[PDB]
Ligand binder design. Structure first.
Ligand SMILES: O=C(O)CCC(=O)C(=O)O
Ligand SMILES: [Fe+3]
Lengths: 338, 343
């Protein structure tokens, strides 16, 4: 209904947001520099008032699918070519969009990264990588990004996933679905509320999607969660507004629970059909409510000529304090550094 | 009457107290925002105001917002104290004789300001079983409840505790806005210094070896069934939680016991009760002073004091703040409602 909340920036609101981002770029080294992240929540208060009003309505809407902020300024000429790999995507020209993504995000909560994702960067990159066309990770193209709750396996999974589209010349859709409980059956719902499923870390948490020199110890937690998954529910909270936690490629029923394996089969067919498209054009920022929706990305053909689709991505928590056991120190934002 | 802020240590807790002193212009700016809110919105906890409160709070003085944000992310904070807000004592009128008479037109602006400060730290919540589910509550002495074990006490020690220690929906912060305090009556505060306790005791306190039962406050429904089960069939819980370097504390000096037959846990618990009792210090809020206690880090209580019941007694506005409103949705009526156990 209001499941998708959209704000289209006026030209002045777009210009004001860009100016704030560019002041941040002048002051701080990286969009996830510790001194910037300490200051971000209060810097975000200087974003346009009309934007702050609508973000706050989104934040307290427990039936949100996504907040979409359209029409941020992106200078395509100044940005330069789409990097061929996330490792090379921390470009001088792309800093300003990282800073703006963190400012928007800091209206919804606190930004976090993962020790086991893109070398523990808090601002990450989504771009097609040659040789990953058919992979199950966000650098895919030819094969759909299978729908998932972000970091479904983890009790420290984000409350919001933020995406800042820098470029999307072929209008490739982000896919989104919620679960209408009164639509699969209060029978299947009860089975999904039961701690009767295994959810494993997706392939982006593997050493193979990180730099080779990363501490083996960062991946201890990921390997444990692959080998010995905890028995967990797919639904939780109030029955009038249950939260969703499932990954289409990394969820199984606990072996010998055909009632569970039956409900999961049913959920996977349902959500696959229910998946709807949101197209993020250049300058469009989305925050997906990761408690309410699964998301993915349509298949596309990458041209690998520097013109390809490029997003900046961020994880947002409503409650940074709750993850302190998994972080190095109070201010550190990288889950699994502890 | 210049802006200042700093860190006041207590024992080995180097950032225990974060103190902010408003300049006259910062005081006036906060007061004008609160007064504008009181003109535009029904109540300090009406749906119209709470939907906007987190954004209206961005209009508080910038220097105060930066220092509050530093407090919010300080996982070793005991108390954030903001001193020097305007209270017009003449216009406020006498301290009401009961909380049921305390939601006065004259005191609205102080409820609004408490919610604005609170909304810099998180989202305000109340409890169906406390002061009729009001989010902005009143702390004042009630004639005939001098010997009481609730915040309306005076002659008797309010025994110290984590706020709502039994509950998974317990506040992350307890906020207090002092309207008057002529006799400088204190809130007592204590955190755990792991350096003053045997590591073996600390190891036991991290164990799920304890029962934390609700005060009789709670108790009257799927919510209230959970309260009865919390008294009769209490879950086994830990007292310390999270990172060894920055553990959260959850204990109630009157309502915590070790699990049946766990003498070692009974020993660790009473070692902790003696430690916190010995480590208690005091925070006094003068008129216009606001405090947020980090309920994840400290227990709090109150010393004996002498109430006059003549309209001059100590009066605070009080609020519960959560870092994560969404996690309590099963215990609230609808998305925007802030009253725990209202559904
Ligand atoms: O490319 C997209 O639109 C989605 C990316 C994504 O889901 C992700 O990287 O987590
Ligand atoms: Fe994703």
């Amino acid at each position: 209904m209001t499941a998708i909340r959209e704000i289209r920036l006026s030209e002045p609101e777009s210009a004001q947001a860009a100016l704030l981002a560019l002041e941040c770029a002048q002051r701080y080294a990286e969009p996830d520099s510790a001194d910037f992240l300490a200051d971000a929540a209060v810097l975000a208060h200087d974003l346009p008032r009309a934007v702050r009003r609508e973000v706050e309505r989104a934040r307290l809407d427990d039936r949100l699918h996504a907040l979409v902020v359209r029409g941020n300024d992106v200078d395509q000429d100044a940005l330069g070519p789409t990097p061929p790999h996330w490792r090379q995507a921390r470009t001088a020209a792309s800093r300003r969009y990282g800073f703006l993504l963190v400012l928007y995000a800091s209206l919804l909560g606190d930004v976090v990264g993962w020790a086991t994702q893109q070398d523990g960067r808090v601002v990450t990159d989504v771009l097609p990588i040659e040789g990953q066309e058919d992979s199950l990770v966000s650098s895919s193209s030819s094969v759909e990004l299978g729908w998932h709750t972000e970091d479904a396996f983890s009790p420290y999974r984000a409350d919001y996933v933020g995406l800042f589209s820098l470029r999307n010349p072929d209008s490739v859709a982000t896919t989104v679905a919620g679960l209408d409980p009164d639509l699969v059956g209060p029978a299947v719902v009860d089975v999904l509320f039961g701690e009767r499923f295994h959810i494993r870390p997706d392939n982006s948490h593997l050493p193979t999607h990180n730099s080779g020199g990363r501490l083996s110890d960062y991946f201890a937690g990921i390997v444990e969660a692959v080998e010995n998954p905890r028995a967990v529910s797919i639904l939780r909270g109030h029955r009038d507004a249950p939260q969703l936690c499932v990954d289409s490629d990394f969820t199984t029923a606990v072996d010998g629970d055909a009632e569970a394996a039956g409900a999961l089969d049913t959920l996977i067919k349902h959500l696959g059909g229910a998946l709807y498209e949101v197209v993020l054009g250049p300058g469009d920022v989305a925050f997906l409510d990761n408690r309410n929706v699964v998301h993915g990305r349509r298949p596309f053909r990458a041209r690998f000529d520097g013109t390809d689709r490029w997003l900046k991505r961020i994880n947002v928590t409503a409650d940074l304090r709750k993850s302190r056991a998994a972080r190095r120190d109070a201010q550190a934002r990288v889950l699994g550094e502890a």
